[PDB]
């Protein structure tokens, strides 16, 4: 991302929506759902906040934090060896290796019995209240304004209170800004290209960045002179 | 003379993936998992935007400087031969 | 004789990216990240402008001056072969 993620509260999107008088029945209750449906639909990893928490594993099972959404990595707290994925169908289950993990609900199923592990996960940033906190970025705000407008105009078009040409414009005005907000938050900066440039151009290729915490990924690969 | 430059748009790297760790696993696998049902692709799928936002392949910023290099080389072998003939000192004269 | 000249339109260089540094990282990676959903490209994408602003590739200023050079090179060879016949001093007699 070329820009930065400066945070504003939810009702900034209601400063913007209620300029349109066919949307002036929206609430803070309605903005909470249609943003959380939106923020999840774009799936931008810059909107989520990165936290790291050491948990303890009891017997091939562990307790997961309450604000988690998506785990980046799990590593061992003593070694630093990251865990790959559980492809085993029969994890803790004895009859008569490389460490792994599998997380379904609030439980993380690992292949190690009694250890402590570090979980790098991604959470939602919140307010003074317990409500989500959106970027101030006027491409994100312009397409979150158009997302709640598109889902409100869909209800009206099903009620028969909006012509097809009005919804077809909002379906199209959203469809362009949904790609622009994708590309605003994904295309690398002048600083994040150096994570890519030092990785793409390699004479002895590095293929084991997952054992580290992807730490040496964009490190420059220097060759000696002889 | 630099190489052939690929115009790559990152509109289909899947959700929850960084551009670096997607490309790092794209070198080592020669297989890039993509996502054609992203929210940015609602225009060309549903039909509200142009259908070239899903297709036509990746363009190349590609100039033919290799053909200009090869033309200058075919002139040096011509003029080193003409300087040889004028003096009367051929290539078998030198070997 | 200068080379072929590639006509480059910079309307897909991403947001906030300098064109000096965009091309510099394109020399390096051979991968030029472009932005197909830029606000400048709302014309052909929405259908309010012609579709040739988002497609059709790049144009070349190429002049076939290299074919003209090979015709002049093959005409000097013919005359030098002719004058070697008039004098009666051939190439295997010069060599």
């Amino acid at each position: 991302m070329v820009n930065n993620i400066n945070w504003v509260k939810l009702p900034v999107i209601l400063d913007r929506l209620l300029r349109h008088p066919l949307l002036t029945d929206l609430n803070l209750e309605t903005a909470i759902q249609y943003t959380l449906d939106f923020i999840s639909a774009m799936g931008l990893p810059n909107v989520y906040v990165d936290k790291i928490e050491t948990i303890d594993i009891k017997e091939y099972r562990g307790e997961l934090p309450c604000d988690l959404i998506s785990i980046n990595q799990v590593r061992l707290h003593k070694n630093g060896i990251a865990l790959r994925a559980m492809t085993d169908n029969f994890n803790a289950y004895p009859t008569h290796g490389e460490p792994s993990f599998k997380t379904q609900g609030r439980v993380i199923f690992t292949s190690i019995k009694h250890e402590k592990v570090d979980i790098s996960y991604k959470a939602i940033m919140l307010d003074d209240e317990g409500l989500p906190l959106i970027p101030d970025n006027p491409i994100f705000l312009k397409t979150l304004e158009l997302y709640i407008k598109k889902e409100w105009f869909t209800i009206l078009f099903d009620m028969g209170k909006i012509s097809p040409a009005v919804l077809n414009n909002t379906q199209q005005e959203y469809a362009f800004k949904a790609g622009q907000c994708n590309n605003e938050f994904v295309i690398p900066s002048v600083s994040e290209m150096e994570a890519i440039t030092n990785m793409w151009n390699q004479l002895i290729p590095r293929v084991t960045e997952f054992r580290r915490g992807f730490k040496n990924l964009g490190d420059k690969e220097y060759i000696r002179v002889h | 003379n630099w190489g052939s430059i690929l115009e790559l748009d990152l509109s289909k790297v899947p959700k929850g993936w960084d551009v670096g760790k997607w490309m790092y696993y794209a070198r080592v696998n020669h297989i890039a998992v993509i996502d054609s049902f992203k929210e940015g692709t609602i225009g060309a799928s549903t039909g509200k935007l142009a259908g070239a936002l899903n297709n036509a392949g990746k363009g190349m910023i590609e100039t033919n400087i290799g053909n200009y290099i090869q033309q200058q080389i075919n002139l040096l072998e011509f003029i080193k031969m003409e300087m040889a003939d004028v003096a009367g000192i051929s290539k078998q004269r030198e070997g | 004789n200068w080379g072929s000249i590639l006509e480059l339109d910079l309307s897909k260089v991403p947001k906030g990216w300098d064109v000096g540094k965009w091309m510099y990282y394109a020399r390096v990676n051979h991968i030029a990240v472009i932005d197909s959903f830029k606000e400048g490209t709302i014309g052909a994408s929405t259908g309010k402008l012609a579709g040739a602003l988002n497609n059709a590739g790049k144009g070349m200023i190429e002049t076939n001056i290299g074919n003209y050079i090979q015709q002049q090179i093959n005409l000097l060879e013919f005359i030098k072969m002719e004058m070697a016949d008039v004098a009666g001093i051939s190439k295997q007699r010069e060599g």
Binding site: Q172 | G47 | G47
Partner: peptide, 4 residues
């Protein structure tokens, strides 16, 4: 409608 469609096809822009």
């Amino acid at each position: 409608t469609s096809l822009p």
